[PDB]
């Protein structure tokens, strides 16, 4: 074959680049970061009408002040989430304080490149880590299996991402309210999803300094889809 | 903790186990069941050092319950007693040995006969018509040697036990706050809900 | 073929092509020499100046091992450093058990066995350096040269890198035209000249000269660097001989 | 054909890496010879110092393994020194454990067993050397035992190794077919050395100066190598024919 | 590095088969046929040897039929050497159970552990699987008489009658034809031989190319005897059934 | 070709292709500049955003109060090597009560990188570093290259189009080397040098990163509103 | 038998004000009836506006102060130069001390 | 990073062949002819001592090896592989039998151990099979005299008489003609010397032929007296002279 | 220990060893699970390339993990035993430390975790097995049916099928299972399960196996006897 930790003549790691292809095949995930909170949204993409859609868990809690959306080989994220939760709870035990969102992300990203002849291959999943801390306020991070993480005002990952990202480039301004961001995530999901967006094949969540990280119930999201469809009829 | 008794009658095994749990100066509890059900027709009573007793009992229980699931079959009381002996005989040369004595009362459904096994913390096993651990034996073995008969009914066995518990309550310095009694027969395990 | 893709594989000739490929990386390197003198040894090396952004005097290439042994090498510099680090562990361990500082022949075989060991397995790469080393022990002066194969011998003089052939020929002259012996201070000047003569082949960039020496009379049997005045004397002697 | 790269069998039941290790044996282009006296074992090897920059004293393929055992190597020097250091370590360890000096043939067997392992285990390459062990063993008398990359070893009346090995062998074969004995029937080691050098000159058809030869001698309780002068003395005596 | 020379013995084909398991099964298909037949009152093990030479020591020998404990025996098809490794493992595993529970090991539990070992060699370790298929003939006091087979895959299944090794397709058809549930041991013995007679790859099926064993109820009632037939007894049972 | 399969294999010309490929990841990396007088040592690093919605990848890491580096290439490798350096600085401090020489930091980094290039199943580091530090022998600048080659310089630049800045510094050598006692003038020279390596886009407030260490200056990082003064 | 512990005496005192705090200690270091030093400070600035003293066995005291000062340094490195809260420092020191639960630091620590 | 070869170098081919065992058997085929014969009151194993050089002292290279006082081994194929197998066979006879039961293992049990070692080289990571076939001749109190063959696979079979290596096909035919179940040991030695002449090209005398018997107990070879139940080794190597004595009546 | 990375990424971003593990499942004998309103039923095809089987002693295709949870599978039979054993140990371990039997979701999540671990561990191939895990959480009467696959992803299903010709019977259940109207009775759920197998299963002979799990550890398997009575009944309902 050839080494698992070998460089291409371009100077990139083959196995890292190939994992990035797996993430492009994954269901869409969008994050928007506002001064009123950070919103996480995902395409659920049930592979058949018989599978119970609310058993699809692609948005996940890490601590009360940190949430996580995933896209790619979602089974690979089990151990990433486990490490993140352990890191967050452990830091609280050692320092009697909430652990910074950047520090949490950096800890998760340290796993990523610990592979080769430690795990056998890189992770086949990208994470949108969203949280609040006192020092740097509301934050969205993109954690790749390359070990690199970027901070974003808004970011899309998965199959819809190329179009969704150019769409976020347009509509994001520094004065977005939370309600606007919720609608804006629904809008861009509906726009890139194959099947038609309802409250069963898509899911919302936010993190506020006040109420922490909450996954929205299907009833709450359904009324935001109504609000979206009504809004776009106007003008 | 303190007193644990067993007697095999015609077609059942009766285990009586003291209810007291004493932490130095104070009796912390007066309703402690010093027993685990290992399988539907096998019961183990235990007495010895604090923590070790329950840790060992629950460890054996889990192992026997795992065997039951794997084979969809209940191990004979002989087989369970042989397993438990080996675990103790293992532990006696450990860095920190299990400090636990046990009675295993089981009804062998394959042979339709009740069996009582007495195993001490060294891994010393014997099949007995009647057995006890620690100081219990010194008071009760004289009564059982006299009154016991291999063909006694369950109620006869309970009466002979009532006599044993009375002698202990008369001559034991320690107040063991009475016994919980349990019967193991062809229909399984039930608790005589007062004495 | 396929015989040259894996280290420690014998070709049908009976050669280890990966060791021979290692030698190419050595030949590709800057020129380095050792001159064995009356009561000591002299080491000199060619340092190419990529840019006047190189701080002069400040990118030292000659390495001391213990207190009485000099090492210089041509080819992959990191590989050389890794070999010296091992040489230092070997010399410290020898001193620890036997109290006496490691004799040069004994020290040569410690590097010899280590370098040879990296030709025994497909899971390691051979050393990309030829190493010229030596110093003063209780039996007088010793100069040695070691190659990626693990092959080493004692030398009157030795050279490796790009300018190895000019140096080799210039060393051969001295051995003939000074048969009874060359003095420590003589060998320092001669070393400077031969590096300047062998700079013919790395003509492209201009260079910085670096000399060290280990002499029983001149340095008390310790390895010291030729700095300041005696350096400038040997640089001047060399400038005169390329005219 | 990856059965050519590691020590696994070829379809015709061959280990090519072992065969190619034997070819590396002759890479130095040196010929060695060993004979037995009554009292001694003599080993002679060609000494070739092509480079004038080399210190000729440091150029040797003869090794003092123990007080009593000497070893000459046909093959590249790095593998030679690897083998020498190992045999030195093995002969010292033997003495410590068993309370007597390691015999020539036992060290030969031990080094041969080590060689055998490299032919069976894949991650170890065989060493490209043939090891000729000589002593005056306290039980067996003068002894020659030789080891190859295959892990083969045997005792010899006399032996030769190198490119011109076959010529030196038949030359010695003929002397023994004639003389009709196991050994060189000679009193002094000096005259067994003279015999060895003589029959090397005849078989190779070339003449030797004092710096063209390397000589080792095994006697009761010491094996030693001759200096340039000890050889020069010995060459001068050979002139009287 | 060393990756170059690695066959990868534990990977899937694009069809989702285990290359090395399939090739090991191919290996076993060239091995001397072994037959197991389970009667109402016992089990028969019969095995044909790879074409014997007349100088091969006939009597003091057992290359095909091995004893695991007093109540369990196996017939081997494949590499004898690979089989003996697994057999010694099984013999120990049986003795471990007896020491732990003071009861003879149930036949299936022994069969499962041996099958679980084989399975391991197909999923991890990068070693070749064992080129061996077993027919397990045993008795326990839960299921009475039991016939099992295990193959290099680590798969095992229960049987009324089964063959392993060469010409099993031919043999399985002949057994499927003449086998019935009420059948007694002496009938099963006769069926076993008749089957090898028809599926053997040489003309004469003589005593010297046969290993034979029975696990019978026959003893002092309630206890089980295990009989590995001496060559004279195989010659007798071959003359009795009129094959010689 | 066939000799780029792993780091344990030499080419017939005698090159390590896996190392050369690692070297390649640096030139794809965003430009970073190093330069120093006798009193101060400055890092200027051009930071690269993923897109318009993303943050600007931080390129400068602090190692001790007297030492720190800028990175070009794989940031995770910069994190591992900077973290290793922090430990060595910390070890020198705790055991010997001694600020670690910048020259010794270079040797330790070289020897760590080398180990990954000589044994099977490893991989070269895919990052280049510029190490500045004020130690017991004045101001120092180092260029680390994942071949293991570490070089002490007056100034340099590494990454994409870094050749521009590297020739400017090669010209301005005698100007900047004698900016002693002035922090701002030594930084300005660095911001002018990095400008030679730009095209189309040029230095905004949140794309530019400056670090300075010196005689009476702990190694400190300037970002955002605190670099507006230099644009 | 080797006794790994000693007693270097000394006394320390911490008082909390409304918008200030004092941590005081004598500067005397003793063993048995001898004075080792008349000025050997045992109250240290640890940065992030935290002062610390580990009084008792000076070797264990210096070891702990040194480890906590290092803990501060790495908190800055790992959490983007964040200021270590006095409560967060307090919890960190608990883990430092309890880390050696079965071979204690023979010191009474005040921050 | 030394030994990365933790995977089998012997794998099944699509045809179901194990390549490296077949190739090892090929290597044995090339080997010098060796044979063994069971008499009623003993066993004989014999082989040719093919010399590399006439200068070689072929008494030093011993192809027939004592494993226990009552068990001997001879081989065809690769001599070095045989040498290390004899060393491991001698040691395993002690470590896993004599040090437990205080007596030497019976022939089939020691054969079983040698077979096991050879099977592991057939499956263990980073090794080739042994390139030898052994003939192991021995006696034990409860089995009497026996002769076994062990192949690179680890397979072993008992023989009345057999041969391996170069001229095995030829020699096996010769032995079939001459073998009966009523051979006295002396008769089997004579037959072994006849069978071996066929395959031997060059000189055929006591110095080119290696021959050992598992026969009667040899008190003279024991080295001590005083224990009446230790009667000494049944294994005996025939001297150069003792072989030539029988080449008269040939 | 053997270190080699067997499950690695391909240029198209696929892990072939995982995808090939699914091919082994595709080949596996068909298995189906159907949620009742207060029961779950596990149906299993058993191939008839062989009779002369002994079915008292042959491994049954539905395994009890605990007294309240069962696991069926499609794919490599030997591989399934290793997952079943680990799950049974984890079930007893959960009881021992939490003092409560596993939830079906937890036991699923564990088995799924084991399967995933073997997709990024050196020297191991993924499990050639997909599983249906069915049962009732302790002191709960709401039924649970989960699926796991070699990749390690798992999810809850109203009804689901795995193994050979599963696309056929998934199409059947998609057409014949109303979520608004789950099979109310036990008999109703058992019928729909057998019907879906009879699209694929050849004969009604010893080709079908049904296991029915009710709440409070009420698990019982039907004998050919009682399945034949569904096979007989559905056959006589084809008269349109």
Swiss-Prot record, chain B:
Pfam families: Proteasome. Belongs to the peptidase T1B family. Its main location: cytoplasm. The modification N-acetylmethionine is found at residue 1. The 26S proteasome consists of a 20S proteasome core and two 19S regulatory subunits. The 20S proteasome core is composed of 28 subunits that are arranged in four stacked rings, resulting in a barrel-shaped structure. The two end rings are each formed by seven alpha subunits, and the two central rings are each formed by seven beta subunits. The catalytic chamber with the active sites is on the inside of the barrel. Non-catalytic component of the proteasome which degrades poly-ubiquitinated proteins in the cytoplasm and in the nucleus. It is essential for the regulated turnover of proteins and for the removal of misfolded proteins. The proteasome is a multicatalytic proteinase complex that is characterized by its ability to cleave peptides with Arg, Phe, Tyr, Leu, and Glu adjacent to the leaving group at neutral or slightly basic pH. It has an ATP-dependent proteolytic activity. This subunit has a chymotrypsin-like activity. Keywords: Acetylation, Cytoplasm, Nucleus, Phosphoprotein, Proteasome. This is Proteasome subunit beta type-4. The lineage of its organism: Eukaryota, Fungi, Dikarya, Ascomycota, Saccharomycotina. Present with 21800 molecules/cell in log phase SD medium. The keyword Nucleus applies. The gene is PRE1. One of its GO terms (molecular function) is endopeptidase activator activity. The modification Phosphoserine is found at residue 76. It comes from the Eukaryota.
UniProtKB/Swiss-Prot annotation, chain C:
The keyword Nucleus applies. Its main location: cytoplasm. Keywords: Acetylation, Cytoplasm, Nucleus, Proteasome. It is found in: Cytoplasm; Nucleus. One of its GO terms (cellular component) is proteasome complex. One of its GO terms (biological process) is proteasome-mediated ubiquitin-dependent protein catabolic process. The alpha and beta forms are probably products of the same gene with different post-translational modifications. It comes from the Eukaryota. Signal peptide: none annotated. GO terms for molecular function: mRNA binding. The keyword Hydrolase does not apply. The 26S proteasome consists of a 20S proteasome core and two 19S regulatory subunits. The 20S proteasome core is composed of 28 subunits that are arranged in four stacked rings, resulting in a barrel-shaped structure. The two end rings are each formed by seven alpha subunits, and the two central rings are each formed by seven beta subunits. The catalytic chamber with the active sites is on the inside of the barrel. The proteasome degrades poly-ubiquitinated proteins in the cytoplasm and in the nucleus. It is essential for the regulated turnover of proteins and for the removal of misfolded proteins. The proteasome is a multicatalytic proteinase complex that is characterized by its ability to cleave peptides with Arg, Phe, Tyr, Leu, and Glu adjacent to the leaving group at neutral or slightly basic pH. It has an ATP-dependent proteolytic activity. Present with 12000 molecules/cell in log phase SD medium. Belongs to the peptidase T1A family.
Swiss-Prot record, chain D:
It is found in: Cytoplasm; Nucleus. Pfam families: Proteasome, Proteasome_A_N. The modification Phosphoserine is found at residue 227. It comes from the Eukaryota. The keyword Acetylation applies. There is a cross-link at residue 222 (Glycyl lysine isopeptide (Lys-Gly) (interchain with G-Cter in ubiquitin)). SUPFAM superfamilies: N-terminal nucleophile aminohydrolases (Ntn hydrolases). Gene3D superfamilies: Glutamine Phosphoribosylpyrophosphate, subunit 1, domain 1. InterPro entries: Ntn_hydrolases_N, Proteasome_alpha, Proteasome_alpha-type, Proteasome_asu_N, Proteasome_sua/b, Proteasome_subunit_alpha6. Keywords: Acetylation, Cytoplasm, Isopeptide bond, Nucleus, Phosphoprotein, Proteasome, Ubl conjugation. CDD domains: proteasome_alpha_type_6 (cd03754). The 26S proteasome consists of a 20S proteasome core and two 19S regulatory subunits. The 20S proteasome core is composed of 28 subunits that are arranged in four stacked rings, resulting in a barrel-shaped structure. The two end rings are each formed by seven alpha subunits, and the two central rings are each formed by seven beta subunits. The catalytic chamber with the active sites is on the inside of the barrel. Interacts with CIC1. Present with 15200 molecules/cell in log phase SD medium. Belongs to the peptidase T1A family. This is Proteasome subunit alpha type-1. The gene is SCL1.
Curated annotation (Swiss-Prot), chain G:
It comes from Saccharomyces cerevisiae (strain ATCC 204508 / S288c) (Baker's yeast). The chain holds residues 20 to 130 of 241 of the full protein. The 26S proteasome consists of a 20S proteasome core and two 19S regulatory subunits. The 20S proteasome core is composed of 28 subunits that are arranged in four stacked rings, resulting in a barrel-shaped structure. The two end rings are each formed by seven alpha subunits, and the two central rings are each formed by seven beta subunits. The catalytic chamber with the active sites is on the inside of the barrel. Belongs to the peptidase T1B family. Non-catalytic component of the proteasome which degrades poly-ubiquitinated proteins in the cytoplasm and in the nucleus. It is essential for the regulated turnover of proteins and for the removal of misfolded proteins. The proteasome is a multicatalytic proteinase complex that is characterized by its ability to cleave peptides with Arg, Phe, Tyr, Leu, and Glu adjacent to the leaving group at neutral or slightly basic pH. It has an ATP-dependent proteolytic activity. This is Proteasome subunit beta type-6. It comes from the Eukaryota. It is found in: Cytoplasm; Nucleus.
């Amino acid at each position: 074959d050839r080494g698992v930790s070998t460089f291409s003549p371009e100077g990139r790691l083959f196995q890292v680049e190939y994992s990035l292809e797996a993430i492009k095949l994954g269901s869409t995930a969008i994050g928007i970061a506002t001064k009123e909170g950070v919103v996480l949204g995902v395409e659920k993409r049930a592979t058949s009408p018989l599978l119970e859609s609310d058993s699809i868990e692609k948005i996940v809690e890490i601590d009360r002040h940190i949430g996580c959306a995933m896209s790619g080989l979602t089974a690979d994220a089990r151990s990433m989430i486990e490490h993140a939760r352990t890191a967050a709870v452990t830091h609280n035990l050692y320092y009697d304080e909430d652990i910074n969102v950047e520090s949490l992300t950096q800890s998760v990203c340290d796993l990523a490149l610990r592979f080769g002849e430690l795990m056998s291959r890189p992770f086949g999943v990208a994470l949108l880590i969203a949280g609040h801390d006192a020092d740097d306020g509301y934050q969205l991070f993109h954690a790749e299996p390359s070990g690199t993480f970027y901070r974003y005002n808004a970011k899309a990952i998965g199959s819809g991402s190329e179009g969704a990202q150019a769409e976020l480039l347009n509509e994001w301004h520094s004065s977005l309210t939370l309600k606007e961001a919720e609608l804006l995530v629904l809008k861009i999901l509906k726009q890139v999803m194959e099947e038609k967006l309802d409250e069963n094949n898509a899911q919302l969540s936010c993190i506020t300094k006040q109420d922490g990280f909450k996954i929205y119930d299907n009833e709450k999201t359904a009324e935001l889809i109504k609000e979206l469809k009504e809004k776009e009829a106007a003008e | 903790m303190d007193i644990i008794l067993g007697i095999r009658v015609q077609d059942s095994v009766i285990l009586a186990s003291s209810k007291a749990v004493t932490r130095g100066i104070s009796v912390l509890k007066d309703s402690d069941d010093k027993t685990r059900q290992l399988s539907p027709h096998t019961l183990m009573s235990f007495a010895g050092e604090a923590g070790d007793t329950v840790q060992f009992a629950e460890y054996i229980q889990a192992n026997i319950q795992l065997y039951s699931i794997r084979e969809d079959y209940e191990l004979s009381p002989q087989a369970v007693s042989s397993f438990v002996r080996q675990e103790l005989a293992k532990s006696i040369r450990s860095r920190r040995p299990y400090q636990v004595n046990v009675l295993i009362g089981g009804y062998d459904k394959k042979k339709n006969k009740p069996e009582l096994y007495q195993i001490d913390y060294l891994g010393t096993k014997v099949e007995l018509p009647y057995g006890a651990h620690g100081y219990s034996g010194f008071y009760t073995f004289s009564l059982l040697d006299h009154h016991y008969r291999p063909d006694m009914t369950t109620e006869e066995g309970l009466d002979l036990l009532k006599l044993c518990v009375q002698e202990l309550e008369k001559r034991m310095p320690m107040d063991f706050k009475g016994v919980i009694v349990k019967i193991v027969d062809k229909d399984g395990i039930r608790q005589v809900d007062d004495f | 073929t396929g015989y040259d893709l894996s280290n420690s594989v014998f070709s049908p000739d009976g050669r280890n092509f990966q060791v021979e490929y290692a030698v190419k990386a050595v030949e590709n390197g800057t020129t380095s020499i050792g001159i064995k003198c009356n009561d000591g040894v002299v080491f000199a090396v060619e340092k190419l100046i990529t840019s006047k952004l190189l701080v002069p005097q400040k990118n030292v290439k000659i390495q001391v091992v213990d207190r009485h042994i000099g090492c210089v090498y041509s080819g992959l510099i990191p590989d050389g450093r890794h070999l010296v680090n091992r040489g230092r562990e070997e010399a410290a361990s020898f001193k620890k058990l036997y109290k006496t500082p490691i004799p040069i022949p004994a020290f040569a075989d410690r590097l010899g066995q280590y370098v040879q060991a990296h030709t025994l397995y497909n899971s390691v790469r051979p050393f990309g350096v030829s190493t010229i080393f030596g110093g003063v022990d209780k039996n007088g002066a010793h100069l040695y040269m070691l190659e990626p194969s693990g092959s080493y011998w004692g030398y009157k003089g030795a050279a490796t890198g790009k300018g190895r052939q000019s140096a080799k020929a210039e060393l051969e002259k001295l051995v003939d035209h000074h048969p009874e012996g060359l003095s420590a201070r003589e060998a320092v000047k001669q070393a400077a000249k031969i590096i300047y003569l062998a700079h013919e082949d790395n003509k492209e960039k201009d260079f910085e000269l670096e000399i060290s020496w280990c002499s029983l009379s001149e340095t008390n049997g310790l390895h010291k660097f030729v700095k300041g005045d005696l350096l400038q004397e040997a640089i001047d002697f060399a400038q005169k001989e390329i005219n | 054909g990856y059965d050519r790269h590691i020590t696994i069998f070829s379809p015709e039941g061959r280990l090519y890496q072992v065969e190619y290790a034997f070819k590396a044996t002759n890479q130095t282009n040196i010929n060695s010879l060993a004979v037995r006296g009554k009292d001694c074992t003599v080993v002679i090897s060609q000494k070739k110092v092509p480079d004038k920059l080399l210190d000729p004293t440091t150029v040797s393929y003869i090794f003092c393994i123990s007080r009593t055992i000497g070893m000459v190597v046909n093959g590249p020097i790095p593998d030679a020194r690897n083998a020498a250091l190992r045999a030195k370590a093995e002969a010292a360890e033997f003495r410590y454990k068993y309370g007597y000096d390691m015999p020539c043939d036992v060290l030969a067997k031990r080094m041969a067993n080590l060689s055998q392992i490299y032919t069976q285990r894949a991650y170890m390459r065989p060493l490209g050397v043939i090891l000729t062990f000589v002593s005056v063993d306290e039980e067996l008398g003068p002894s020659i035992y030789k080891t190859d990359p295959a892990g083969y070893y045997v005792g010899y009346k006399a032996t030769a190794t190198g490119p011109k090995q076959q010529e030196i062998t038949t030359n010695l074969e003929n002397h023994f077919k004639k003389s009709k004995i196991d050994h060189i029937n000679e009193e002094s080691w000096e005259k067994v050395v003279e015999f060895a050098i003589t029959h090397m000159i005849d078989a190779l058809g070339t003449e030797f100066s004092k710096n063209d030869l390397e000589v080792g001698v095994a006697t009761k309780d010491k094996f030693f190598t001759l200096s340039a002068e000890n050889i020069e003395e010995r060459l001068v005596a050979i002139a009287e024919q | 590095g060393s990756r170059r020379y690695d066959s990868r013995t534990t990977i899937f084909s694009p069809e989702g088969r285990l290359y090395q398991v399939e090739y090991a099964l191919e290996s076993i298909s060239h091995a001397g046929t072994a037959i197991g037949i389970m009667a109402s009152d016992g089990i028969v093990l019969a095995a044909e040897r790879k074409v014997t030479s007349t100088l091969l020591e006939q009597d003091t020998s057992t290359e095909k039929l091995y004893k695991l404990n007093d109540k369990i025996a196996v017939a081997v098809a494949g590499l004898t050497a690979d089989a003996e490794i697994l057999i010694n493992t099984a013999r120990i595993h049986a003795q471990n159970y007896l020491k732990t529970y003071n009861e003879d090991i149930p036949v299936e539990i022994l069969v499962r552990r041996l099958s679980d070992i084989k399975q391991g060699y197909t999923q991890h370790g990068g070693l070749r699987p064992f080129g061996v298929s077993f027919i397990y003939a045993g008795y326990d006091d839960r299921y009475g008489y039991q016939l099992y087979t295990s193959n290099p895959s680590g798969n095992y299944t229960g049987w009324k009658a089964i063959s392993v090794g060469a010409n099993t397709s031919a043999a399985q058809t002949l057994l499927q034809m003449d086998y019935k549930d009420d059948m007694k041991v002496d009938d099963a013995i006769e069926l076993a031989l008749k089957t090898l007679s028809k599926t053997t790859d040489s003309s004469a099926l003589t005593y010297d190319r046969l290993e034979f064993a029975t696990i019978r109820k026959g003893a002092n009632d309630g206890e089980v005897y295990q009989k590995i037939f001496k060559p004279q007894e195989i010659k007798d049972i071959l003359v009795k059934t009129g094959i010689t | 070709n066939n000799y780029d399969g792993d780091t344990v294999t030499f080419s017939p010309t005698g090159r390590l292709f896996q190392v050369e490929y690692a070297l390649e990841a640096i030139k794809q990396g965003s430009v970073t500049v190093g330069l120093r007088s006798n009193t101060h040592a400055v890092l200027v690093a051009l930071k690269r955003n993923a897109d318009e919605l993303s943050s600007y990848q931080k390129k400068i890491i602090k190692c001790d109060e007297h030492m720190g580096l800028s990175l070009a290439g794989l940031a995770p490798d910069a994190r591992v090597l900077s973290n290793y350096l922090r430990q060595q600085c910390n070890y020198s401090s705790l055991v010997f009560n001694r600020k670690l020489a910048v020259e010794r930091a270079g040797h330790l980094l070289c020897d760590k990188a080398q180990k990954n290039t000589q044994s099977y199943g490893g991989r070269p580091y895919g990052v280049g570093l510029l190490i500045i530090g004020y130690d017991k022998s004045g101001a120092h600048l180092l260029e680390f290259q994942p071949s293991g080659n570490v070089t002490e310089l007056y100034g340099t630049a590494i990454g994409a189009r870094s050749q521009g800045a590297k020739t400017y510094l090669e010209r301005t050598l005698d100007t900047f080397i004698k900016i002693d006692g002035n922090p701002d003038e030594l930084i300005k020279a660095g911001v002018e040098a990095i400008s030679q390596s730009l095209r189309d886009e040029s230095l905004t407030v949140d794309n530019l990163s400056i670090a300075i260490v010196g005689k009476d200056t702990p190694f400190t990082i300037y970002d955002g509103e605190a670099v507006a003064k230099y644009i | 038998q080797f006794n790994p512990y000693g007693d270097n005496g000394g006394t320390i005192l911490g008082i909390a004000g409304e918008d200030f705090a004092v941590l005081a200690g004598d500067t005397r270091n003793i063993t048995d009836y001898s004075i080792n030093s008349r000025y050997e400070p045992k109250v240290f600035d640890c940065g992030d506006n935290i002062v610390m003293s580990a009084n008792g066995f000076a070797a264990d005291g210096d070891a702990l102060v040194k480890r906590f000062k290092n803990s501060v340094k790495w908190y800055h490195f790992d959490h983007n130069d964040k200021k270590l809260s006095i409560n967060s420092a307090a919890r960190n020191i608990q883990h430092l001390l309890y880390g050696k639960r079965f071979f204690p630091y023979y010191v009474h620590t005040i921050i | 990073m030394t030994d990365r070869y933790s995977f089998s170098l012997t794998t099944f081919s699509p045809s179901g062949k194990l390549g490296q065992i077949d190739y090892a058997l090929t290597a044995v085929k090339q080997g010098v002819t060796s044979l063994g014969i069971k008499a009623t009151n003993g066993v004989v194993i014999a082989t040719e001592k093919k010399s590399s050089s006439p200068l070689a002292m072929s008494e030093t290279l011993s192809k027939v090896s004592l494993l226990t006082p009552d068990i001997g081994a001879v081989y065809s194929g690769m001599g070095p592989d045989y040498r290390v197998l004899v060393d491991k066979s001698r040691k395993v006879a002690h470590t896993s039998y004599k040090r437990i039961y205080g007596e030497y293992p019976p022939t089939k049990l020691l054969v079983s151990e040698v077979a096991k070692i050879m099977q592991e080289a057939t499956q263990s990571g980073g090794v080739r099979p042994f390139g030898v076939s052994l003939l192991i001749a021995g006696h034990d109190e409860f089995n009497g005299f026996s002769l076994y063959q062990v192949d690179p696979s680890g397979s072993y079979f008992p023989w009345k008489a057999t041969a391996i290596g170069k001229g095995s096909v030829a020699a096996k035919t010769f032995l079939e003609k001459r073998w009966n179940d009523e051979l006295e040991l002396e008769d089997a030695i004579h037959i072994a010397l006849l069978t071996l002449k066929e395959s031997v090209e060059g000189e055929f005398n006591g110095d080119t032929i290696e021959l050992a018997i598992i026969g009667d107990e040899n008190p003279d070879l024991l080295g001590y007296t005083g224990i009446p139940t230790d009667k000494g080794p049944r294994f005996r190597k025939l001297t150069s002279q003792e072989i030539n004595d029988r080449l008269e009546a040939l | 220990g053997y270190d080699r990375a067997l499950s690695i990424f391909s240029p198209d971003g696929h892990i072939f060893q995982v995808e090939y593990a699914l091919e082994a499942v595709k080949r596996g004998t068909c298995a189906v699970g159907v949620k009742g309103k207060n029961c779950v039923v596990l149906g299993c095809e058993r191939r008839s390339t062989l009779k002369l089987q002994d079915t008292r002693i042959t491994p049954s295709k539905v395994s009890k993990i605990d007294s309240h949870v069962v696991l069926s599978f499609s794919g490599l039979n030997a591989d399934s035993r290793i997952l079943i054993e680990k799950a049974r140990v984890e079930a007893q371990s959960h009881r021992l430390t939490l003092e409560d039997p596993v939830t079906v979701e937890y036991l699923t999540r564990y088995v799924a975790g084991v399967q995933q671990r073997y997709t990024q561990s050196g020297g191991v191939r993924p499990f050639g097995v997909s599983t249906l895990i069915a049962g009732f959480d302790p002191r709960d009467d709401e039924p649970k049916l989960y699926q796991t696959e070699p990749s390690g992803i798992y999810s809850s299903w109203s009804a689901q099928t795995i193994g050979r010709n599963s696309k056929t019977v998934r199409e059947f259940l998609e057409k014949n299972y109303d979520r608004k109207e789950p099979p109310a009775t036990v008999e109703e759920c058992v019928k729909l399960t057998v019907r879906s197998l009879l699209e694929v299963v050849q004969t009604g002979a010893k080709n079908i196996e049904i296991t029915v799990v009710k709440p409070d550890s009420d698990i019982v398997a039907l004998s050919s006897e009682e399945i034949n009575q569904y096979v007989t009944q559905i056959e006589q309902e084809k008269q349109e």
